[PDB]
């Protein structure tokens, strides 16, 4: 929120050169100066025969905003023979990526085409150049003898580049192995020591690189984007890369180890064609010393308010934990077709709050499609998803959209002001903008009003003029300041004081400042810095009692501070800024003495009561608990009465009841400060004597790491009196209860079989399913619906196996879906098959039982048993001839034995069901 | 008397109409009393001021053009009409809703246009079978569904640049199959070949010439073609009042937007036509591929239906792509399918199996509800779409329009129309925020007691301080004998709180962080409910303690959405037919069902129970669906009586039931193996003996 | 059978000598 948008540094390059396609800082060791690097991959050069070779420019700061090219090559196209050139540098996009470690400058040309040394071709292996002061080497790890897009022929190496802590280059080339993509890493020393201008394909020792894979991974574009950070155990930075056509254009993100280039972690996109992995970033946003992953999907389509897909782009935010896993949240864009996840740039700590910050850009958003940059401040909780500042592009299109924010670099303090700064490029207009941070000041103010309870009978200040006494008091206001970074040592503030502001609206103002004879007073104030709260004082007084009425409303003293920003010169007024989450004013109230008794002082007798009316709440669900509160003031008036209900972690405040006219609506507010959480309800100012209030407060629960066995609320009334200001604390609890609505359901599929069965013939020894009979399938489901879960339960199946020593439903096989193991008291499928009405249950038939042990079923989970049987047709012919129709009845019962909620009342949950398969003749 | 309109309407005429649609205001200019000048339409029985000077506007849903729905779309001598009405006028006073209805019909014999996009890359050498004799292949299909057919086609390979193009020895510029030791054509981005004509002869002739070209990488980027074929309206020759079908044939995967950065192409697609006299996509080398979002937009604008006619190796891919472009269909293309020579009448069948309503240019403070009557007086609330229709059916939607507050703007016209049809219902919206007497009789420095009355007709209000019907509300605290009952019951304190009543008119006006208003200052503007730390869940404005939800949100808290997409199953039915959609989440009502969309139900009866009802009404003309007249809508499966043949075991789903005649009917249904789940019935059921 | 890479079809086929790696001879005249 502290970037200076007023007067930033504008840099401009030649027309049509895509000046600003890539930006970075240059902070060498041999100079206390710092510079800007801005790539112009379309710029023209003095290289002979080379149209649009591209440049990298060194931009001076501190004055003159002058950018001079850095000449890396100056050489035209080398030759393979007399008229057979070996390389083609025209339109090579030199400068499409620029990176810098302290004195090293790495720039690349991803469209650099190369004739092979085998056959006449034009292959875009791409190249890089690494400059270190005056020494300049050529780095082209894709220009090797592995050619022709079966290998590195179309690498376009240098499409993305980066450095690690230990001076190791990371390079990405998306065209390797039929556009599978490739990563290549080399030691910077090995790059410069092994350089040989007469050798085109250079072996680098200690190189890391990915290999070709199966042709299924073709056209994945690994190396589109790269970032570095450590994710496993050491200090050795590991490799991150975006591969946005992977996984069937879902997109993916590969993380490789920094020591031996082995797969570490994977991220996969949620929606096809979104380009998940167009850009990546590594930075620690929650200050936990663990680097966190940021992945941009600029073309992501989410659901609008109506529910239609809209292209808004989405950035993935994944926080690293020590366990190795990731907590990943998501963050959608704000404007359609803005391409919100295009560039992601860590800023370091833009605010110096202790937690690093990040900037995300939507180059095609804003007004007139001129580009937007949102900055997001990190906190301990992760990233704050609500931007705190918004940078708007200022340059309108010439021919193509000024892609403001397409390239960004941060985390470098160019003005040495203590706060890092931010480069933003817009290659559509050939410009690059540098925003400078500001010195955030945190200011704490005070306001002391001497005696807050004012007697009008007590007149001591004869000072009004004309020597008549009046009832007066003092208004003392203190003001201290402090702030990290470089910023002037004495700050100037403009304090304003307003008396009784609550009725400035045309009613009479019943307190005036002594000398000025007015409600308002202002004073230019000057504090140095750092915790010495400098105070000033004034004298206000109550006008004559005859001049007004309305003694009961309080005199509110209002104080605000301004901090004129004309200070902080020294480079064009880098003006500081107050902490964003800080109040620009403080208020305090004074009361006219009234109805306080003989002691001349108001002493209340405060009581608070609470009744349950809803005696038990169940564990798994989110329960509408309503508390009825009674707040009484049986003594004298209470100044600034507030009901304070301190809720535990499980609780959330819904609101006040307004549908029971017997219960009074209250102004309640949820507050979370001073390491606590509670609800603040206004009870009157003053809360007059004998007053009784009834009101309802609704809540919600989660039970917060189960087996707690109770939720506890604490209630007390607090007032700004001097004596008897508080009520006795009243604790109210509500008992946690276990409720599990468990049910068992069953069905037969089919539920009938009509005899005779087509194409059936008695087999002496049946082998196939078709020989035995049709396929009857019983399915039993144990479904847990109630809020509370359970840990263990049993399930018993009774099955009509035989009748008069003859098979009925020959169980072939059984399956289980869920947390359950079953066991049958008889061998299943002995013969090893491959693939009125009289009821037959266990009361009249030989039964085969199956016993199942159920694990933990939660609120919406179930366990299912599939029984696949064959109708034993042979049985239903001989003595069951034609008028004998049977109902093949099975049953299943369950008993819940165990719950995870120990220490709670536990009631047994048992039930049973039955499933019939009716066999019938279709003759008579 | 003591009613909601008597609290805020007393201030002025504007603020009277604004608080409720039931409010009425009388600025007689003749009869003042001291009663509230804004009470009700009927509470102004006494103190009549009746003939004029009573301001009571009422909202109106006024039809201006409702042509009769056409019976057939084949030269009806004028204006084939698939929607009625065609134009409504809306007059809306603040916070008032007025509803209407719209009738939509997919007429029979509608004109069809078919434009073909053919992949002409090298991989397509073994796929050109599908394109020989295409015109006779196309007339033969569509003739059953329409007369007046038109066809045309174009071709695409890829961007003619590196790294896609063969720039290897210049012998490969004009013959990129040089290295293959054969010959083919130079590559091209998108080449328009044949404008839509009714001359099948010229079509087959122009098609047979076509042969393959060659580039490097398997993605081919037809999306460049899809875009230009959509937005080059005059070049392609799209006809008005004819369904527009755009067919897409390709060998393998496709380039998507942002793939062009590898080619040094960083300018986004503008969705403008760039094909000219050369019939070539000129910007193929300067402009990136189009994104799914822009393709969807330009497809819905120009009312084009995209059909993916792709080979099997890639059918799963474009299926998953079509889910991101709603209303597009995929079809397998292989000379074994028994469907390949249709492939389109099946696609056009799909596209006409649904009618969905879309809204264009909807004013922001306006919000629209929707019911749907899809089948013979079955009103379905919340739906703007009807499922499983045959070409010829007619559906109706009841629409409600609501305005929050009053924009005080000019007339605005938004469109309501079906997806993919030219026909549309245009709604003209005018808002009646101001009374009749606005600039007719208004005071300035006179017409009140002491040269301060201003601000309205009917009463004069005064300057920044000391307002009144007689212009002074003196800052003095004049002692009792002046209250005007700035309180409900006179035993209650001065105006409810936050206000010290002066001069018979409450002087609360105590700005703290939000505004305060009302004759008694009972309204808060910042005391509305919170769902989770956000007032009205962030999706609703707060006025006098009542959440006024935004366009697509409902509820006391404004936390219940009107969406039904999350309720939609993979089959197109909401909640899989077994549940109700409430606040974007299926409430499963049918027992044993659960899951996000009620899809999971293993206790539900086997499909033999639901399909037996189809064979009773289709083959025996009885049963449940026969009595409710739902047989033709719900039973879209083809039913063919068989020769008592039950032949194969390939998933072999056999059923058997017993009808009223005590005869045992048995049938089987081949599930959606090569199609859409046909079911064969064994004729000659088993009946008893004579 | 391996799938062709890039913008290439299956090779051609007269007998299964023209094709390799365990593919077939398509009636259309390709590997498949
Ligand atoms: C993040 O996601 C990444 C991609 O989504 C994951 O990377 C993938 O991990 C896979 C698991 O290791 C890996 O599959 C292995 O691939 C190698 C490749 O070496 C091969 O060597 C042979 C000759 O060069 C050829 O293999 C034969 O088999 C293939 C089919 O697999 C045939 O089609 C071929 O014609 C050939 O006859 C290949 O051409 C290739 O060059 C294999 O050696 C591995 O073999 C192992 O698996 C087999 C079972 O298939 C075992 O029996 C055997 O003992 C081996 O253990 C694997 O198949 C992918 O290549 C790799 N892809 C990429 C792009 O990196 C990554 O793991 C994941 N990380 C995390 C943390 O989740
Ligand atoms: C770096 O230097 C190179 C120098 O070669 C420069 O490239 C040149 O740019 C100009 C203008 O952008 C090109 O001139 C064009 O030439 C083509 C023919 O090849 C013409 O068709 C162009 O348009 C003409 O015709 C139109 C009618 O259809 C007219 O409407 C129009 O006004 C023109 O008359 C135009 O003349 C020139 O070809 C290139 N040279 C090359 C590519 O070799 C490049 O722009 C410089 N880059 C930067 C960043 O400064
Ligand atoms: C009648 O009214 C007059 C003024 O209207 C009033 O005079 C005030 O008297 C009080 C107490 O008698 C004075 O307040 C305190 O005086 C003592 C003197 O020892 C100080 O120690 C106090 O210091 C305060 O501030 C410190 C810094 O914040 C605190 O740390 C400390 O705890 C104290 O709060 C404080 O100044 C006050 O100064 C005078 N005011 C004037 C203008 O004379 C008198 O008390 C009233 N009497 C009756 C009977 O009504
Ligand atoms: C298969 O045959 C059995 C054998 O009867 C059927 O079982 C059910 O048995 C119960 C006995 O409790 C009966 O249900 C009763 O129905 C009467 C009305 O007919 C009702 O008044 C009772 O309160 C009770 O619900 C009945 O015999 C039978 N159930 C039904 C619904 O008829 C079983 O239903 C048969 N299965 C199939 C699929 O037909
Ligand atoms: C919007 O917010 C409100 C309140 O925050 C939610 O209402 C509360 O939740 C449900 C209604 O959805 C009500 O039912 C309660 O839950 C159990 C669940 O089994 C039910 O059996 C009980 O009857 C119990 O009352 C609850 O009363 C209700 N409370 C209030 C104060 O409204 C609502 O769910 C939210 N809606 C959405 C779409 O988020
Ligand atoms: C490549 O490096 C990784 C990590 O450095 C190796 O994986 C494990 O590394 C840890 C220490 O970092 C060892 O304690 C484990 O025993 C390693 N796993 C093994 C040996 O299976 C990995 O082994 C290295 N080599 C590869 C991937 O070939
Ligand atoms: C067993 O299941 C039955 C239902 O299958 C339930 O008991 C009955 O439930 C309904 C009320 O919801 C009524 O039929 C009776 O009032 C209940 N009978 C009772 C409570 O005895 C219940 O889920 C289980 N009941 C028992 C006794 O185990
Ligand atoms: C859509 O269906 C709803 C279903 O209730 C109906 O609208 C409401 O119906 C009941 C009346 O008993 C109440 O919820 C509301 O008074 C009705 N809303 C209105 C009149 O706007 C009605 O059939 C259809 N409503 C709309 C708005 O289309
Ligand atoms: C405070 O600063 C303003 C700024 O110009 C000036 O006008 C005023 O006189 C100053 N007052 C004091 C007391 O310094
Ligand atoms: C089922 O058996 C496995 C292996 O014996 C065991 O690990 C698992 O906990 C069992 N599940 C239940 C619910 O008993
Ligand atoms: C509005 O209410 C229902 C909603 O569908 C509609 O049928 C009815 O005709 C409308 N009533 C009026 C008076 O417009
Ligand atoms: C298509 O989507 C399904 C899930 O919806 C997935 O399992 C499948 O692999 C996808 N296939 C392709 C080709 O995208
Ligand atoms: Cl194929
Ligand atoms: Mn590491
Ligand atoms: Mn971290
Ligand atoms: Mn920070
Ligand atoms: Mn700085
Ligand atoms: Mn007292
Ligand atoms: Mn092919
Ligand atoms: Mn291609
Ligand atoms: Mn191809």
From Swiss-Prot, chain A:
Topology feature Extracellular, residues: 1-924
InterPro entries: FG-GAP, Int_alpha_beta-p, Integrin_alpha, Integrin_alpha_C_CS, Integrin_alpha_Ig-like_1, Integrin_alpha_Ig-like_2, Integrin_alpha_Ig-like_3, Integrin_alpha_N
Membrane topology: Single-pass type I membrane protein
Record keyword Membrane present: yes
Binding site for Ca(2+) 1: 230, 232, 234, 236, 238
Keyword field contains Signal: yes
Gene3D superfamilies the record matches: Bicelle-embedded integrin alpha(iib) transmembrane segment (1.20.5.930), Integrin alpha, N-terminal (2.130.10.130), Integrin domains. Chain A, domain 2 (2.60.40.1460), ntegrin, alpha v. Chain A, domain 3 (2.60.40.1510), ntegrin, alpha v. Chain A, domain 4 (2.60.40.1530)
Positions bound to Ca(2+) 4: 413, 415, 417, 419, 421
Principal subcellular localisation of the protein: membrane
SMART domains the record matches: Int_alpha
Binding residues for Ca(2+) 3: 349, 351, 353, 355, 357
GO biological process: angiogenesis; apolipoprotein A-I-mediated signaling pathway; apoptotic cell clearance; calcium ion transmembrane transport; cell adhesion; cell adhesion mediated by integrin; cell migration; cell-cell adhesion
Glycan-carrying positions: 44, 260, 266, 458, 524, 585, 674, 805, 821, 883, 911, 918
Disulfide bond entries: 59-67, 108-128, 142-155, 461-472, 478-535, 596-602, 668-681, 822-852, 842-847
Domain of life: Eukaryota
GO cellular component: alphav-beta3 integrin-HMGB1 complex; alphav-beta3 integrin-IGF-1-IGF1R complex; alphav-beta3 integrin-PKCalpha complex; cell surface; cytosol; external side of plasma membrane; extracellular exosome; filopodium membrane
Per-repeat ranges for FG-GAP: 2-68, 79-140, 143-195, 207-261, 262-327, 328-385, 389-452
Keywords: Calcium, Cell adhesion, Cell junction, Cell membrane, Cleavage on pair of basic residues, Disulfide bond, Glycoprotein, Host cell receptor for virus entry, Host-virus interaction, Integrin, Membrane, Metal-binding, Receptor, Repeat, Signal, Transmembrane, Transmembrane helix
Residue numbers binding Ca(2+) 2: 284, 286, 288, 290, 292
Quaternary organization: Heterodimer of an alpha and a beta subunit. The alpha subunit is composed of a heavy and a light chain linked by a disulfide bond. Alpha-V (ITGAV) associates with either beta-1 (ITGB1), beta-3 (ITGB3), beta-5 (ITGB5), beta-6 (ITGB6) or beta-8 (ITGB8). Interacts with CIB1. Interacts with RAB25. Integrins ITGAV:ITGB3 and ITGAV:ITGB5 interact with FBLN5 (via N-terminus). ITGAV:ITGB3 and ITGAV:ITGB5 interact with CCN3. ITGAV:ITGB3 interacts with ADGRA2. ITGAV:ITGB3 interacts with FGF2; it is likely that FGF2 can simultaneously bind ITGAV:ITGB3 and FGF receptors. ITGAV:ITGB3 interacts with IL1B.
Miscellaneous section: The constitutive activation of ITGAV:ITGB3 on neoplastic cells may contribute to tumor growth and metastatic potential.
Family: Belongs to the integrin alpha chain family.
Record-given protein name: Integrin alpha-V
Protein's gene: ITGAV
Swiss-Prot record, chain B:
Impact upon substituting residue 140 to I: Probable risk factor for neonatal thrombocytopenia; alloantigen Duv(a+); does not affect significantly the integrin function
Membrane topology: Single-pass type I membrane protein
Residues the entry annotates as binding Ca(2+) 2: 158, 215, 217, 219-220, 251
Region CX3CL1-binding, annotated ranges: 267-287
Compartments, as annotated in UniProt: Cell membrane; Cell projection, Lamellipodium membrane; Cell junction, Focal adhesion; Postsynaptic cell membrane
Described purpose of this protein according to its UniProt entry: Integrin alpha-V/beta-3 (ITGAV:ITGB3) is a receptor for cytotactin, fibronectin, laminin, matrix metalloproteinase-2, osteopontin, osteomodulin, prothrombin, thrombospondin, vitronectin and von Willebrand factor. Integrin alpha-IIb/beta-3 (ITGA2B:ITGB3) is a receptor for fibronectin, fibrinogen, plasminogen, prothrombin, thrombospondin and vitronectin. Integrins alpha-IIb/beta-3 and alpha-V/beta-3 recognize the sequence R-G-D in a wide array of ligands. Integrin alpha-IIb/beta-3 recognizes the sequence H-H-L-G-G-G-A-K-Q-A-G-D-V in fibrinogen gamma chain. (Microbial infection) Integrin ITGAV:ITGB3 acts as a receptor for Herpes virus 8/HHV-8.
Illness: Glanzmann thrombasthenia 2: A form of Glanzmann thrombasthenia, a disorder characterized by failure of platelet aggregation, absent or diminished clot retraction, and mucocutaneous bleeding of mild-to-moderate severity. Glanzmann thrombasthenia has been classified into clinical types I and II. In type I, platelets show absence of glycoprotein IIb-IIIa complexes at their surface and lack fibrinogen and clot retraction capability. Bleeding disorder, platelet-type, 24: An autosomal dominant disorder of platelet production characterized by congenital macrothrombocytopenia and platelet anisocytosis. Affected individuals may have no or only mildly increased bleeding tendency.
Protein name per UniProt: Integrin beta-3
Species for this entry: Homo sapiens
């Amino acid at each position: 929120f502290n970037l200076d948008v007023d007067s930033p540094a504008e840099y401009s390059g030649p027309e049509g050169s895509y000046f600003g396609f890539a930006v970075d800082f240059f902070v060498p060791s041999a100079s206390s100066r710092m510079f800007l690097l801005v790539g112009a991959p379309k710029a023209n050069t003095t290289q002979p025969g080379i149209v649009e070779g591209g440049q990298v420019l060194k931009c001076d700061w501190s004055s003159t905003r002058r950018c001079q090219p850095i000449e890396f090559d100056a050489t035209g196209n080398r030759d393979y023979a007399k008229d057979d050139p070996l390389e083609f540098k025209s339109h090579q996009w030199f400068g499409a990526s620029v990176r810098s470690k302290q004195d090293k400058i790495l720039a690349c040309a991803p469209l650099y085409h190369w004739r092979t040394e085998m056959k006449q071709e034009r292959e875009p292996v791409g190249t890089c150049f690494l400059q270190d002061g005056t020494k300049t080497v050529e780095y082209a790890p894709c220009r090797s003898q592995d050619i022709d897009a079966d290998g590195q022929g179309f690498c376009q190496g240098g499409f993305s580049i980066d450095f690690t802590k230990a001076d190791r280059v990371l390079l990405g080339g998306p065209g390797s192995f039929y556009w599978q993509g490739q990563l290549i890493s080399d030691q910077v020393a090995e790059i410069v020591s092994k350089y040989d201008p007469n050798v085109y394909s250079i072996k680098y020792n200690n190189q890391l690189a990915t290999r070709t894979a199966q042709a299924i991974f073709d056209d994945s574009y690994l190396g589109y984007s790269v970032a570095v950070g450590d994710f496993n155990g050491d200090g050795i930075d590991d490799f991150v890369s975006g591969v946005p056509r992977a996984a069937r254009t879902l997109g993916m993100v590969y993380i490789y180890d920094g020591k031996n280039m082995s797969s570490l972690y994977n991220f996969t996109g949620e929606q096809m064609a979104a380009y998940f992995g167009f850009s990546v970033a590594a930075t620690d946003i929650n200050g936990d010393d663990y680097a966190d992953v940021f992945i941009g999907a600029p073309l992501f389509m989410d659901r609008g308010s109506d529910g239609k897909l809209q292209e808004v782009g989405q950035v993935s935010v994944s926080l690293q934990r020590a366990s190795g896993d990731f907590q990943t949240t998501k963050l959608n864009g704000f404007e359609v077709f803005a391409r919100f996840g295009s560039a992601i740039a860590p800023l370091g700590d833009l605010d110096q709050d202790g937690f690093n910050d990040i900037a995300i850009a939507a180059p095609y958003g804003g007004e007139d499609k001129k580009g937007i940059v949102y900055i997001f401040n990190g906190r301990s909780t992760g990233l704050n998803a609500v931007p705190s500042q918004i940078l708007e592009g200022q340059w309108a299109a010439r021919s193509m959209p000024p892609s403001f924010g397409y390239s960004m670099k941060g985390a470098t303090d160019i003005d040495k002001n203590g706060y890092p700064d931010l480069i933003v490029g817009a290659f559509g207009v050939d410009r690059a903008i540098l925003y400078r941070a500001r010195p955030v000041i945190t200011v704490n103010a005070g306001l002391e009003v001497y005696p807050s309870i004012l007697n009008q009978d007590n007149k001591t200040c004869s000072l009004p003029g004309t020597a008549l006494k009046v009832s007066c008091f003092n208004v003392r206001f203190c003001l201290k300041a402090d702030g990290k970074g470089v910023l002037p040592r004495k700050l100037n503030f403009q304090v304003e004081l307003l008396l009784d502001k609550l009725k400035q609206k045309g009613a009479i103002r019943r307190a005036l400042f002594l000398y000025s004879r007015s409600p308002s007073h202002s004073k230019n104030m000057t504090i140095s810095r750092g915790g010495l709260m400098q105070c000033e004082e004034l004298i206000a007084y109550l006008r004559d009692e005859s001049e007004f009425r309305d003694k009961l409303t309080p005199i509110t003293i209002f104080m605000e501070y301004r901090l004129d920003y004309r200070t902080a010169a020294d480079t064009t007024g880098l003006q500081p800024i107050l902490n964003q989450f800080t109040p620009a004013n403080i208020s305090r109230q004074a009361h006219i003495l009234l109805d306080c008794g003989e002691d001349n002082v108001c002493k209340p007798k405060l009581e608070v009561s609470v009744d349950s009316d809803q005696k038990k709440i169940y564990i798994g669900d989110d329960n509408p608990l309503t508390l009825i509160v009674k707040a009484q003031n049986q003594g004298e008036g209470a100044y600034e009465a507030e009901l304070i209900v301190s809720i535990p972690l499980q609780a959330d405040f819904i609101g006040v009841v307004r549908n029971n006219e017997a219960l009074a609506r209250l102004s309640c507010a949820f507050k979370t400060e001073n390491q606590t959480r509670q609800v603040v309800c206004d009870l009157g100012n003053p809360m007059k004597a004998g007053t009784q209030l009834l009101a309802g407060l609704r809540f919600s629960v989660h039970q917060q790491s189960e087996m707690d066995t109770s939720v506890k609320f604490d209630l007390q009334i607090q007032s700004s009196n001097l004596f008897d200001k508080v009520s006795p604390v009243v604790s109210h609890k509500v008992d946690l209860a276990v409720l599990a609505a468990v049910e068992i359901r069953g069905v037969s599929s089919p539920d009938h079989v009509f005899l005779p069965i087509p194409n059936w013939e008695h087999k002496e020894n049946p082998e196939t399913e078709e020989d035995v009979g049709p396929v009857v399938q019983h399915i039993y489901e144990l479904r847990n619906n109630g809020p509370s879960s359970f840990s263990k339960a049993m399930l018993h199946l009774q099955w009509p196996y035989k009748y008069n020593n003859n098979t009925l439903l020959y169980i072939l096989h059984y399956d289980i879906d869920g947390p359950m193991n079953c066991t049958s008291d008889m061998e299943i499928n002995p013969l090893r098959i491959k693939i009125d009405i009289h009821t037959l249950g266990c009361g009249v038939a030989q039964c085969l039982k199956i016993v199942c042990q159920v694990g933990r079923l939660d609120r919406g989970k179930s366990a299912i048993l599939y029984v696949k049987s064959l109708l034993w047709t042979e049985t239903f012919m001989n003595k069951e001839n034609q008028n004998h129709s049977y109902s093949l009845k099975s049953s299943a019962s369950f008993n819940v034995i165990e719950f995870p909620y120990k220490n709670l009342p536990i009631e047994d949950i048992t039930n049973s069901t039955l499933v019939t398969t009716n066999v019938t003749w279709g003759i008579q | 008397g003591p009613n909601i309109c008597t609290t805020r309407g007393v201030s002025s005429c504007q603020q009277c109409l604004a608080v409720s649609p039931m409010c009425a205001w009388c600025s007689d200019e003749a009869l003042p009393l001291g009663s509230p000048r804004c009470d009700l339409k009927e509470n102004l029985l006494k103190d009549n001021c009746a003939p004029e000077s009573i301001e009571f506007p009422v909202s109106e849903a006024r039809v201006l053009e409702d042509r009769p729905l056409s019976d057939k779309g084949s030269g009806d001598s004028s204006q084939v009409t698939q929607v009625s009405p065609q134009r409504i006028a809306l007059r809306l006073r603040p916070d008032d809703s007025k509803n209407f209805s719209i009738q939509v019909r997919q007429v029979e014999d509608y004109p069809v246009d078919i434009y073909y996009l053919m992949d002409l890359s090298y991989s397509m050498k073994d796929d050109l079978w599908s394109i020989q004799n295409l015109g006779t292949k196309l007339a033969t299909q569509m003739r059953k569904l329409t007369s007046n057919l038109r066809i045309g086609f174009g071709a695409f390979v890829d961007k003619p640049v590196s790294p896609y193009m063969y720039i290897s020895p210049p012998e490969a510029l004009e013959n990129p199959c040089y290295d293959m030791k054969t010959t083919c054509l130079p590559m091209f981005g998108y080449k328009h070949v044949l404008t839509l004509t009714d001359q099948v002869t010229r079509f087959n002739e122009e098609v047979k010439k076509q042969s393959v070209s060659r580039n490097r990488d398997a993605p081919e980027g037809g999306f460049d073609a899809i875009m230009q074929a959509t937005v080059c309206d005059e070049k392609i020759g799209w006809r008005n009042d004819a369904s527009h079908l755009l067919v897409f044939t390709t060998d393998a995967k496709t380039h998507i937007a942002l793939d062009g950065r590898l080619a040094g192409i960083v300018q986004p697609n503008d969705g403008q036509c760039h094909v000219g006299s050369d019939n070539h996509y000129s910007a193929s080398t300067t402009m990136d591929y189009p994104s799914l979002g822009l393709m969807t937009e330009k497809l819905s604008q120009k009312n084009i239906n995209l059909i993916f006619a792709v080979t099997e190796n890639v059918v799963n891919l474009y299926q998953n792509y079509s889910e991101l472009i709603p209303g597009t269909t995929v079809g397998v293309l292989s000379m074994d399918s028994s469907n390949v020579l249709q492939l389109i009448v099946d696609a056009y069948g799909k596209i006409r199996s649904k009618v969905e309503l879309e809204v264009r240019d909807l004013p922001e403070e306006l919000s629209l509800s929707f019911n749907a009557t899809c089948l013979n007086n079955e009103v379905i609330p919340g739906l703007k779409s009807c499922m499983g229709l045959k070409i010829g059916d007619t559906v109706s939607f009841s629409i409600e329009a609501k305005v929050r507050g009053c924009p005080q703007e000019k007339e605005k016209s938004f469109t309501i129309k079906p997806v993919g049809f030219k026909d549309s219902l245009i709604v003209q919206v005018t808002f009646d925020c101001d009374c009749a007497c606005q600039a007719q009789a208004e005071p300035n420095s006179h017409r009140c007691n002491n040269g301060n009355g201003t601000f309205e007709c009917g009463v004069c209000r005064c300057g920044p301080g000391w307002l009144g019907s007689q212009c002074e509300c003196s800052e003095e605290d004049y002692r009792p004998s002046q209250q005007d009952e700035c309180s409900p019951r006179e035993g209650q304190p001065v105006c409810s709180q936050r206000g010290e009543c002066l001069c018979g008119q409450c002087v609360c006006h105590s700005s703290d962080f939000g505004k305060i208003t009302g004759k008694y200052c009972e309204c808060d503007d910042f005391s509305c409910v919170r769902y989770k730390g956000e007032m009205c869940s962030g999706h609703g404005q707060c006025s006098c303690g009542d959440c006024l939800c935004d366009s697509d949100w409902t509820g006391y808290y404004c936390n219940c959405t009107t969406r039904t997409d999350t309720c939609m199953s993979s089959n197109g039915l909401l909640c899989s037919g077994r549940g109700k959609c409430e606040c974007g989440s299926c409430v499963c009502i049918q027992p044993g069902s659960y899951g996000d969309t009620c899809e999971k139900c293993p206790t539900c009866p086997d499909a033999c129970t639901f399909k037996k009802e189809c064979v009773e009404c289709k083959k025996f003309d009885r049963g449940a669906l026969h009595d409710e007249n739902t047989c033709n809508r719900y039973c879209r499966d083809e039913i063919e009586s068989v020769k008592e043949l039950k032949d194969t075991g390939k998933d072999a789903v056999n059923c058997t039931y017993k009808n009223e005649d005590d005869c045992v009917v048995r049938f089987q249904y081949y599930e959606d193996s090569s199609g859409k789940s046909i079911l064969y019935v064994v004729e000659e059921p088993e009946c008893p003996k004579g | 059978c391996p799938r062709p890479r890039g913008d290439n079809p299956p090779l051609t086929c007269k007998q299964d000598s023209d094709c390799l790696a365990g593919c077939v001879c398509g009636p259309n005249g390709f590997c498949g």
